[PDB]
Each structure stands twice: as structure tokens, then as C-alpha cells.
Amino acid sequence: RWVPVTVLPGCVGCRTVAALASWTVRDVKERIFAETGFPVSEQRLWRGGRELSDWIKIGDLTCHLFVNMQ
């Protein structure tokens, strides 16, 4: 059985947030903005090589969630 293993060379500036399943992607962005001052409008969340639309619920994605902000 296959298990894809992503190795992070260190994890500087990595941030972990406590989402509920009922949150959406836009919800995460808002949470990120509230904590870093990094504008929601400029955030692009990606998960395994695909960008995540604002309206996707987080619970629909799952279990530790990893999203890349590119």
C-alpha cells in the first residue's frame, strides 16, 4: 500500500490553526489574517498541487491538514 511522504526541510514560520470541520477555506484565511496581518485577498491556499477555492469546507478535506500558502 502506497503512503506519500512529504518531507519538510525544517518548518520555519509554519503556523497551525485550530479549525472546525464546519469552517471553510475562507474561514482559515480570515483566521490567518487575524493573526499575521497577511491580507485575505492575497492568500492562495494549496493542497497537494491544487489551489483551494474559498467555499470548500475544511471537514470535507479529511487527520492533520497541510496547506501551502503560495
Side-chain angles (χ1 to χ4, degrees), residues 1-14 16-25 27-34 36-49 51-56 58-62 64-69:
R1 185 233 308 180
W2 288 24
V3 182
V5 174
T6 290
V7 176
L8 316 171
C11 209
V12 210
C14 280
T16 307
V17 323
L20 301 180
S22 68
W23 293 24
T24 68
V25 163
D27 290 321
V28 186
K29 296 190 179 177
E30 307 278 355
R31 173 52 84 120
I32 283 156
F33 169 72
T36 66
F38 193 98
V40 171
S41 62
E42 299 309 304
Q43 285 174 55
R44 300 300 182 271
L45 297 191
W46 294 70
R47 181 178 179 279
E51 174 165 356
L52 289 160
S53 307
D54 286 290
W55 59 82
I56 297 171
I58 295 314
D60 289 326
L61 308 167
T62 82
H64 202 328
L65 209 67
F66 282 82
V67 297
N68 181 19
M69 193 190 283

mmCIF file with all atom_site columns, all heavy atoms in Angstrom, residues 34-47, unseen atoms left out:
data_model
loop_
_atom_site.group_PDB
_atom_site.id
_atom_site.type_symbol
_atom_site.label_atom_id
_atom_site.label_alt_id
_atom_site.label_comp_id
_atom_site.label_asym_id
_atom_site.label_entity_id
_atom_site.label_seq_id
_atom_site.pdbx_PDB_ins_code
_atom_site.Cartn_x
_atom_site.Cartn_y
_atom_site.Cartn_z
_atom_site.occupancy
_atom_site.B_iso_or_equiv
_atom_site.pdbx_formal_charge
_atom_site.auth_seq_id
_atom_site.auth_comp_id
_atom_site.auth_asym_id
_atom_site.auth_atom_id
_atom_site.pdbx_PDB_model_num
ATOM 1   N N   . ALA A 1 34 ? -6.149 37.454 10.891 1.00 0.00 ? 34 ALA A N   1
ATOM 2   C CA  . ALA A 1 34 ? -6.316 37.961 12.240 1.00 0.00 ? 34 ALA A CA  1
ATOM 3   C C   . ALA A 1 34 ? -5.031 37.791 13.043 1.00 0.00 ? 34 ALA A C   1
ATOM 4   O O   . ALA A 1 34 ? -4.773 38.546 13.980 1.00 0.00 ? 34 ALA A O   1
ATOM 5   C CB  . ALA A 1 34 ? -7.479 37.262 12.928 1.00 0.00 ? 34 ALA A CB  1
ATOM 6   N N   . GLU A 1 35 ? -4.210 36.820 12.653 1.00 0.00 ? 35 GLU A N   1
ATOM 7   C CA  . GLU A 1 35 ? -3.014 36.501 13.420 1.00 0.00 ? 35 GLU A CA  1
ATOM 8   C C   . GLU A 1 35 ? -1.706 37.072 12.858 1.00 0.00 ? 35 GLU A C   1
ATOM 9   O O   . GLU A 1 35 ? -0.744 37.228 13.598 1.00 0.00 ? 35 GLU A O   1
ATOM 10  C CB  . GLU A 1 35 ? -2.889 34.984 13.562 1.00 0.00 ? 35 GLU A CB  1
ATOM 11  N N   . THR A 1 36 ? -1.657 37.397 11.570 1.00 0.00 ? 36 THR A N   1
ATOM 12  C CA  . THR A 1 36 ? -0.400 37.844 10.951 1.00 0.00 ? 36 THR A CA  1
ATOM 13  C C   . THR A 1 36 ? -0.503 39.206 10.254 1.00 0.00 ? 36 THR A C   1
ATOM 14  O O   . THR A 1 36 ? 0.498  39.824 9.912  1.00 0.00 ? 36 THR A O   1
ATOM 15  C CB  . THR A 1 36 ? 0.097  36.815 9.918  1.00 0.00 ? 36 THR A CB  1
ATOM 16  O OG1 . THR A 1 36 ? -0.831 36.754 8.827  1.00 0.00 ? 36 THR A OG1 1
ATOM 17  C CG2 . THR A 1 36 ? 0.222  35.432 10.548 1.00 0.00 ? 36 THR A CG2 1
ATOM 18  N N   . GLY A 1 37 ? -1.719 39.665 10.031 1.00 0.00 ? 37 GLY A N   1
ATOM 19  C CA  . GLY A 1 37 ? -1.904 40.870 9.261  1.00 0.00 ? 37 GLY A CA  1
ATOM 20  C C   . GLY A 1 37 ? -1.730 40.596 7.783  1.00 0.00 ? 37 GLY A C   1
ATOM 21  O O   . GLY A 1 37 ? -1.642 41.530 6.990  1.00 0.00 ? 37 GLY A O   1
ATOM 22  N N   . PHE A 1 38 ? -1.684 39.322 7.401  1.00 0.00 ? 38 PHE A N   1
ATOM 23  C CA  . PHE A 1 38 ? -1.496 38.995 5.997  1.00 0.00 ? 38 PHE A CA  1
ATOM 24  C C   . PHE A 1 38 ? -2.851 38.926 5.312  1.00 0.00 ? 38 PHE A C   1
ATOM 25  O O   . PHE A 1 38 ? -3.634 38.020 5.578  1.00 0.00 ? 38 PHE A O   1
ATOM 26  C CB  . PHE A 1 38 ? -0.730 37.686 5.835  1.00 0.00 ? 38 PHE A CB  1
ATOM 27  C CG  . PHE A 1 38 ? -0.219 37.434 4.429  1.00 0.00 ? 38 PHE A CG  1
ATOM 28  C CD1 . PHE A 1 38 ? 1.094  37.727 4.089  1.00 0.00 ? 38 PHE A CD1 1
ATOM 29  C CD2 . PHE A 1 38 ? -1.042 36.887 3.458  1.00 0.00 ? 38 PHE A CD2 1
ATOM 30  C CE1 . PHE A 1 38 ? 1.570  37.485 2.802  1.00 0.00 ? 38 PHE A CE1 1
ATOM 31  C CE2 . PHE A 1 38 ? -0.571 36.641 2.163  1.00 0.00 ? 38 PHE A CE2 1
ATOM 32  C CZ  . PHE A 1 38 ? 0.732  36.941 1.838  1.00 0.00 ? 38 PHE A CZ  1
ATOM 33  N N   . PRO A 1 39 ? -3.121 39.889 4.419  1.00 0.00 ? 39 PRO A N   1
ATOM 34  C CA  . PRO A 1 39 ? -4.415 40.102 3.748  1.00 0.00 ? 39 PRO A CA  1
ATOM 35  C C   . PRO A 1 39 ? -5.028 38.844 3.118  1.00 0.00 ? 39 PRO A C   1
ATOM 36  O O   . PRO A 1 39 ? -4.404 38.148 2.314  1.00 0.00 ? 39 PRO A O   1
ATOM 37  C CB  . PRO A 1 39 ? -4.090 41.142 2.661  1.00 0.00 ? 39 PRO A CB  1
ATOM 38  C CG  . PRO A 1 39 ? -2.595 41.151 2.553  1.00 0.00 ? 39 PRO A CG  1
ATOM 39  C CD  . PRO A 1 39 ? -2.087 40.804 3.912  1.00 0.00 ? 39 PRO A CD  1
ATOM 40  N N   . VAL A 1 40 ? -6.266 38.576 3.516  1.00 0.00 ? 40 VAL A N   1
ATOM 41  C CA  . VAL A 1 40 ? -7.077 37.516 2.951  1.00 0.00 ? 40 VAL A CA  1
ATOM 42  C C   . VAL A 1 40 ? -7.051 37.522 1.433  1.00 0.00 ? 40 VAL A C   1
ATOM 43  O O   . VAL A 1 40 ? -6.919 36.478 0.799  1.00 0.00 ? 40 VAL A O   1
ATOM 44  C CB  . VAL A 1 40 ? -8.525 37.646 3.426  1.00 0.00 ? 40 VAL A CB  1
ATOM 45  C CG1 . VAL A 1 40 ? -9.443 36.673 2.677  1.00 0.00 ? 40 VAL A CG1 1
ATOM 46  C CG2 . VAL A 1 40 ? -8.586 37.448 4.938  1.00 0.00 ? 40 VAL A CG2 1
ATOM 47  N N   . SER A 1 41 ? -7.159 38.714 0.860  1.00 0.00 ? 41 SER A N   1
ATOM 48  C CA  . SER A 1 41 ? -7.205 38.877 -0.579 1.00 0.00 ? 41 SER A CA  1
ATOM 49  C C   . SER A 1 41 ? -5.941 38.335 -1.226 1.00 0.00 ? 41 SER A C   1
ATOM 50  O O   . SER A 1 41 ? -5.970 37.787 -2.312 1.00 0.00 ? 41 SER A O   1
ATOM 51  C CB  . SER A 1 41 ? -7.410 40.352 -0.941 1.00 0.00 ? 41 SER A CB  1
ATOM 52  O OG  . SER A 1 41 ? -6.337 41.150 -0.475 1.00 0.00 ? 41 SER A OG  1
ATOM 53  N N   . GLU A 1 42 ? -4.822 38.454 -0.546 1.00 0.00 ? 42 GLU A N   1
ATOM 54  C CA  . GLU A 1 42 ? -3.606 37.961 -1.151 1.00 0.00 ? 42 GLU A CA  1
ATOM 55  C C   . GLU A 1 42 ? -3.300 36.500 -0.812 1.00 0.00 ? 42 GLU A C   1
ATOM 56  O O   . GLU A 1 42 ? -2.220 36.032 -1.118 1.00 0.00 ? 42 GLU A O   1
ATOM 57  C CB  . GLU A 1 42 ? -2.424 38.838 -0.750 1.00 0.00 ? 42 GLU A CB  1
ATOM 58  C CG  . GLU A 1 42 ? -2.550 40.291 -1.192 1.00 0.00 ? 42 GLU A CG  1
ATOM 59  C CD  . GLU A 1 42 ? -2.873 40.442 -2.675 1.00 0.00 ? 42 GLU A CD  1
ATOM 60  O OE1 . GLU A 1 42 ? -2.111 39.913 -3.510 1.00 0.00 ? 42 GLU A OE1 1
ATOM 61  O OE2 . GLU A 1 42 ? -3.895 41.084 -3.003 1.00 0.00 ? 42 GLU A OE2 1
ATOM 62  N N   . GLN A 1 43 ? -4.222 35.759 -0.211 1.00 0.00 ? 43 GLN A N   1
ATOM 63  C CA  . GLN A 1 43 ? -3.857 34.397 0.169  1.00 0.00 ? 43 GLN A CA  1
ATOM 64  C C   . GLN A 1 43 ? -4.287 33.313 -0.814 1.00 0.00 ? 43 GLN A C   1
ATOM 65  O O   . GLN A 1 43 ? -5.436 33.222 -1.172 1.00 0.00 ? 43 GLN A O   1
ATOM 66  C CB  . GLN A 1 43 ? -4.425 34.060 1.536  1.00 0.00 ? 43 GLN A CB  1
ATOM 67  C CG  . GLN A 1 43 ? -3.721 34.681 2.692  1.00 0.00 ? 43 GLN A CG  1
ATOM 68  C CD  . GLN A 1 43 ? -4.466 34.399 3.963  1.00 0.00 ? 43 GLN A CD  1
ATOM 69  O OE1 . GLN A 1 43 ? -4.737 33.241 4.291  1.00 0.00 ? 43 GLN A OE1 1
ATOM 70  N NE2 . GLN A 1 43 ? -4.845 35.447 4.671  1.00 0.00 ? 43 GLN A NE2 1
ATOM 71  N N   . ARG A 1 44 ? -3.349 32.462 -1.198 1.00 0.00 ? 44 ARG A N   1
ATOM 72  C CA  . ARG A 1 44 ? -3.631 31.341 -2.078 1.00 0.00 ? 44 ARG A CA  1
ATOM 73  C C   . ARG A 1 44 ? -3.294 30.021 -1.400 1.00 0.00 ? 44 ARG A C   1
ATOM 74  O O   . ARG A 1 44 ? -2.122 29.642 -1.334 1.00 0.00 ? 44 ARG A O   1
ATOM 75  C CB  . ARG A 1 44 ? -2.827 31.465 -3.371 1.00 0.00 ? 44 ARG A CB  1
ATOM 76  C CG  . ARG A 1 44 ? -3.129 32.708 -4.149 1.00 0.00 ? 44 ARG A CG  1
ATOM 77  C CD  . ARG A 1 44 ? -4.585 32.723 -4.534 1.00 0.00 ? 44 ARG A CD  1
ATOM 78  N NE  . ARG A 1 44 ? -4.932 33.887 -5.337 1.00 0.00 ? 44 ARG A NE  1
ATOM 79  C CZ  . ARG A 1 44 ? -5.321 35.052 -4.832 1.00 0.00 ? 44 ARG A CZ  1
ATOM 80  N NH1 . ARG A 1 44 ? -5.404 35.217 -3.516 1.00 0.00 ? 44 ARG A NH1 1
ATOM 81  N NH2 . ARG A 1 44 ? -5.627 36.056 -5.650 1.00 0.00 ? 44 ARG A NH2 1
ATOM 82  N N   . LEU A 1 45 ? -4.306 29.317 -0.913 1.00 0.00 ? 45 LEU A N   1
ATOM 83  C CA  . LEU A 1 45 ? -4.051 28.084 -0.209 1.00 0.00 ? 45 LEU A CA  1
ATOM 84  C C   . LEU A 1 45 ? -4.107 26.902 -1.183 1.00 0.00 ? 45 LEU A C   1
ATOM 85  O O   . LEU A 1 45 ? -5.021 26.776 -1.985 1.00 0.00 ? 45 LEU A O   1
ATOM 86  C CB  . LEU A 1 45 ? -5.034 27.919 0.954  1.00 0.00 ? 45 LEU A CB  1
ATOM 87  C CG  . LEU A 1 45 ? -4.908 29.006 2.026  1.00 0.00 ? 45 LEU A CG  1
ATOM 88  C CD1 . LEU A 1 45 ? -5.682 28.686 3.280  1.00 0.00 ? 45 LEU A CD1 1
ATOM 89  C CD2 . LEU A 1 45 ? -3.444 29.245 2.370  1.00 0.00 ? 45 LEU A CD2 1
ATOM 90  N N   . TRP A 1 46 ? -3.092 26.054 -1.099 1.00 0.00 ? 46 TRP A N   1
ATOM 91  C CA  . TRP A 1 46 ? -2.893 24.922 -1.996 1.00 0.00 ? 46 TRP A CA  1
ATOM 92  C C   . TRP A 1 46 ? -2.727 23.635 -1.214 1.00 0.00 ? 46 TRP A C   1
ATOM 93  O O   . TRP A 1 46 ? -2.141 23.640 -0.133 1.00 0.00 ? 46 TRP A O   1
ATOM 94  C CB  . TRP A 1 46 ? -1.650 25.116 -2.843 1.00 0.00 ? 46 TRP A CB  1
ATOM 95  C CG  . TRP A 1 46 ? -1.728 26.223 -3.799 1.00 0.00 ? 46 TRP A CG  1
ATOM 96  C CD1 . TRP A 1 46 ? -1.732 27.552 -3.519 1.00 0.00 ? 46 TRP A CD1 1
ATOM 97  C CD2 . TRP A 1 46 ? -1.780 26.109 -5.216 1.00 0.00 ? 46 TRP A CD2 1
ATOM 98  N NE1 . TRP A 1 46 ? -1.802 28.275 -4.672 1.00 0.00 ? 46 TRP A NE1 1
ATOM 99  C CE2 . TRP A 1 46 ? -1.827 27.413 -5.735 1.00 0.00 ? 46 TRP A CE2 1
ATOM 100 C CE3 . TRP A 1 46 ? -1.802 25.027 -6.099 1.00 0.00 ? 46 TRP A CE3 1
ATOM 101 C CZ2 . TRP A 1 46 ? -1.895 27.672 -7.098 1.00 0.00 ? 46 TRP A CZ2 1
ATOM 102 C CZ3 . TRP A 1 46 ? -1.868 25.284 -7.448 1.00 0.00 ? 46 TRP A CZ3 1
ATOM 103 C CH2 . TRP A 1 46 ? -1.913 26.597 -7.937 1.00 0.00 ? 46 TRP A CH2 1
ATOM 104 N N   . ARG A 1 47 ? -3.205 22.522 -1.754 1.00 0.00 ? 47 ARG A N   1
ATOM 105 C CA  . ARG A 1 47 ? -3.083 21.261 -1.032 1.00 0.00 ? 47 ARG A CA  1
ATOM 106 C C   . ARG A 1 47 ? -2.785 20.082 -1.930 1.00 0.00 ? 47 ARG A C   1
ATOM 107 O O   . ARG A 1 47 ? -3.686 19.502 -2.526 1.00 0.00 ? 47 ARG A O   1
ATOM 108 C CB  . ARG A 1 47 ? -4.357 20.987 -0.245 1.00 0.00 ? 47 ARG A CB  1
ATOM 109 C CG  . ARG A 1 47 ? -4.300 19.712 0.552  1.00 0.00 ? 47 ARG A CG  1
ATOM 110 C CD  . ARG A 1 47 ? -5.576 19.557 1.313  1.00 0.00 ? 47 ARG A CD  1
ATOM 111 N NE  . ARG A 1 47 ? -5.603 18.329 2.084  1.00 0.00 ? 47 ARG A NE  1
ATOM 112 C CZ  . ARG A 1 47 ? -5.903 17.155 1.568  1.00 0.00 ? 47 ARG A CZ  1
ATOM 113 N NH1 . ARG A 1 47 ? -6.175 17.066 0.280  1.00 0.00 ? 47 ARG A NH1 1
ATOM 114 N NH2 . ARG A 1 47 ? -5.918 16.075 2.333  1.00 0.00 ? 47 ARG A NH2 1
#
